[PDB]
């Protein structure tokens, strides 16, 4: 199974320490449900940092 996949795990787990980070960003939080896995997802936020920070 594990169907669950699509990622849409660390989606708002993630981002839900991303809007209080201050950062508001779309291109943060809508690419991250893009991602592939979690450590995608995870790995995007931690992007931002420098990836625009």
């Given at each position: 199974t594990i169907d669950q996949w699509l990622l849409k795990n660390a989606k708002e787990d993630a981002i839900a320490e991303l809007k209080k980070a201050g950062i508001t960003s779309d291109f943060y939080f809508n690419?991250?449900?893009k991602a592939k896995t979690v450590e995608e997802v995870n790995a995007l936020?931690?992007?931002i940092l420098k990836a625009h920070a």
């Open positions: 690419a991250i449900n936020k931690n992007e």
